[PDB]
């Protein structure tokens, strides 16, 4: 110790500036802290978690406070399709006068920012109606944040910190989390939907003052007890419904309609109440599986042992995986990220097709800013899952306790996994690019029919299995004979089939040859991205070039020039190269979503369906064409609202281009440059009176990679995020 950092003595005595940089990056790595013990390791994590909940609640109290102090929330409700939602107010004392005018919009009095996070619609749907609901909404969350900060402190004192056995109780935790956390919360959210939300959308204002008088259903709390639940779906909202008033307002609370609300282009309220009620039950019943204290229920250790296939094809099967998971934090985190990485992509995919908030399918910019947002989050999280897979194989894996089980075998044929991933990537790469250049050339010479247009028929067959009639394949749910059709003709099909054939929504868009070629480009990304990460994980423990890689840790610079040079060998670097392919891959996904929708919203769907088969079509008709309004944010003639997005656009290009400087130019050059400089400063008069306390040295090899990637990612997000918002909001269509 003896100075910053307090948690690492080896860094403390480092005299150079390396200590300061490395005292920040290794703050949260609790294992490598000096004098750590397994009780501290958990107790810090538990306290740290409460710190992360404090931020989340404080963060959400910010949004409610500004939207209700500087926002259009009461006015926006009065006409959702013609009043720009307002995020907050602008007070920047560098603004000149024509900017102050330009950024005054949305019916405010000074400059403001238009909110594209779509909070305004979400709070409309879930029943909020004035400013005052929001203020108490702010206070409450602010209080919840205060409560969490107490807890993070409380569980560090003696007589309030859990022991080891408390955290390692994997059974009693899975009951509560499955039954209490996932379970009851979904049941209670159903309660709010049918006590406030649904009554709000029928003109009834129900609040904590009076929510005891009002009845969710005029015969409420009976029909459920008797067993004839067949009354809560009796008389739903009429087709001609106005979302905020009583016209056509039915009285059903739980339904199964499945279509869209005709006016607001969203899912029906009464479906969403039912669904959270349905999956409120599944988790409750799924919550009583494992044994805690009462002598019934499975033992997760036993289930793993029992599933050992006879014949030996899976060796000793899942034997011993209980302890290996239940003792390796980096294992548990890996699984959490993998599951969280998927559903976030799932959230992105479902929200834009089935708009769950009122008046959010016609705010085009909000759609794009949301779907693009969640995919990039999902791209990052999924990379972490493999990254903490590698740390598992290094720090916590044990090659004895996992003898021949399913886990050790994945280290036994690592050659077979790696090569085939290489094959599938190569096959997709050659031909997806191959057919593309061919399509490009054939159009360069003035012959568009000589392209290779492969009809994506399997996805068109599936769309025909869900009821889309454009392709006329006449299969299940698209053919009248099918029992599957008959099994649903009176429950949800009339609404679901009416939504799927409507040509305004994004539910099952028509796909053509363009969508075939892009999907493989997407598919190419996933394999190649996986290949780097999977190659990193399985070779973390060792390989032929260095069969004792485990003795150095997850992240080390290199192993020297010998044996032919070993640059970029740490499993860290495998994560490093991976991010580049993630950003490229997610680049190819969000690109595709934006252009397909931006042609749709204009009703010009032919433009995508032809230009999207040759690369110059993507460069001319999407990038070059749609950026005409963005780059004019400010010119020698004047400025516009779009100036801020024009500025950020270049700011994105600048950070990105600084990224190259750290990736290409490596350390040894700069270190020789500092030494001359640290000589000049030591001989200049009037400036040899000031002496560095910490000697100046160039960044370390790994730090430059991390720093270089930080710029590349930041510049790559800001650049696209500016173009995505400005181009769409410029036309608002």
């Amino acid at each position: 110790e003896l100075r910053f950092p307090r948690f690492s003595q080896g860094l403390a005595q480092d005299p150079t500036t390396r200590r300061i940089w490395f005292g920040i990056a290794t703050a949260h790595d609790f294992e490598s802290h000096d004098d750590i013990t397994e009780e501290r390791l958990y107790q810090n994590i538990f306290a740290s978690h409460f710190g992360q909940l404090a931020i989340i609640f404080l963060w959400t109290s910010g949004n409610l406070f500004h939207v209700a102090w500087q926002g259009n929330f009461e006015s926006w409700i009065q006409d959702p399709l013609h009043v720009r939602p307002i995020a907050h107010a602008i007070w920047d004392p560098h603004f000149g006068q024509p900017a102050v005018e330009a950024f005054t919009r949305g019916g405010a009095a000074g400059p403001v920012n238009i909110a594209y996070s779509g909070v305004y619609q979400w709070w409309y749907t879930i029943g909020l109606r004035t400013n005052e609901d929001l203020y108490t909404g702010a206070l409450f969350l602010l209080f919840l944040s205060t409560l969490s900060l107490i807890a993070s402190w409380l569980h560090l004192q003696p007589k309030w910190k859990p022991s080891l056995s408390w955290f390692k109780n994997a059974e009693s935790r899975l009951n509560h989390h499955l039954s209490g956390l996932f379970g009851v919360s979904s049941l209670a959210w159903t309660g709010h939907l049918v006590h406030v939300a649904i009554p709000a959308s029928r003109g009834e204002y129900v609040r904590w003052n009076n929510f005891l008088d009002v009845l969710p259903y005029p015969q409420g709390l009976g029909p459920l007890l008797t067993g004839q639940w067949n009354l809560y779906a009796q008389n739903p909202d009429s087709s001609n419904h106005l979302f905020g008033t009583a016209q056509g307002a039915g009285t059903a609370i739980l339904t199964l309609l499945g279509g869209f609300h005709p006016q607001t282009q969203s899912l029906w309220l009464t479906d969403m109440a039912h669904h959270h009620l349905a999956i409120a039950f599944i988790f409750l019943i799924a919550g009583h599986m494992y044994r805690t204290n009462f002598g019934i229920g499975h033992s997760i250790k036993d289930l793993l042992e029992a599933h050992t296939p006879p014949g030996g094809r899976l060796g000793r099967g899942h034997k011993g995986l209980y302890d290996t998971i239940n003792n390796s934090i980096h294992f548990q985190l890996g699984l959490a990220l993998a599951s969280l990485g998927v559903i976030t992509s799932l959230v992105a995919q479902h929200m834009y097709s089935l708009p769950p908030y009122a008046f959010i399918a016609q705010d085009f910019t909000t759609q794009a800013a949301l779907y693009t947002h969640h995919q990039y989050i999902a791209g990052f999280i999924m990379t972490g899952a493999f990254a903490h897979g590698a740390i598992f194989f290094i720090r916590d894996y044990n090659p004895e306790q996992n003898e021949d089980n399913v886990l050790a075998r994945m280290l036994d044929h690592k050659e077979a996994i790696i090569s085939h991933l290489s094959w599938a990537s190569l096959f997709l790469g050659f031909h997806t690019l191959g057919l593309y250049v061919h399509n490009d050339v054939m159009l360069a010479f003035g012959t568009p029919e000589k392209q290779i247009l492969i009809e994506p028929i399997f996805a068109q067959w599936i769309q025909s299995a869900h009821g889309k009639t454009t392709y006329g394949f006449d299969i299940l749910l698209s053919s009248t004979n099918g029992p599957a059709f008959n099994a649903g003709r009176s429950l949800w099909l009339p609404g679901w089939l009416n939504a799927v054939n409507e040509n305004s929504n994004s539910l099952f868009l028509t796909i053509g040859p363009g969508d075939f070629l892009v999907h493989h480009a997407i598919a190419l990304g996933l394999h190649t991205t996986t290949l780097i990460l999977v190659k990193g994980a399985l070779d973390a423990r060792g390989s032929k070039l260095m069969p004792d890689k485990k003795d150095f840790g997850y992240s080390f610079p290199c192993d020297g020039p010998g044996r032919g040079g070993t640059c970029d060998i740490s499993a860290w670097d495998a994560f490093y190269l991976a991010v580049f392919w993630m950003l490229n891959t997610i680049g190819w996904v969000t690109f595709y979503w934006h252009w397909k929708h931006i042609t749709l919203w204009q009703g010009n769907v032919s433009q995508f369906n032809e230009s999207s088969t040759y690369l110059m079509g993507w460069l001319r008709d999407y990038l070059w064409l749609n950026s005409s309004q963005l780059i004019n944010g400010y010119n020698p003639f004047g400025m516009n609202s779009l100036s801020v997005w024009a500025w950020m656009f270049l700011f994105g290009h600048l950070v990105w281009a600084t990224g190259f400087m750290f990736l290409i130019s490596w350390r040894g050059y700069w270190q020789e440059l500092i030494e001359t400089l640290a000589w000049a400063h030591e001989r200049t008069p009037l400036a040899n009176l000031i002496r560095w306390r910490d000697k100046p040295v160039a960044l370390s090899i790994v730090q430059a990679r991390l720093v270089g990637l930080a710029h590349f990612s930041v510049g790559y997000i800001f650049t696209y995020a500016a173009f995505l918002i400005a181009s769409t909001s410029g036309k608002f269509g």
Partner: peptide, 30 residues
């Protein structure tokens, strides 16, 4: 009104005190 006070405080003062506070803590020695 209120922004004209809170914007400078979080933009100018609160950074300055923060940077000067850390600088002493980082550069301590015991």
């Amino acid at each position: 009104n209120l922004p004209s006070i809170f914007v400078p405080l979080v933009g100018l003062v609160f950074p300055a005190i923060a940077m000067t506070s850390l600088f002493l803590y980082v550069q301590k020695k015991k």
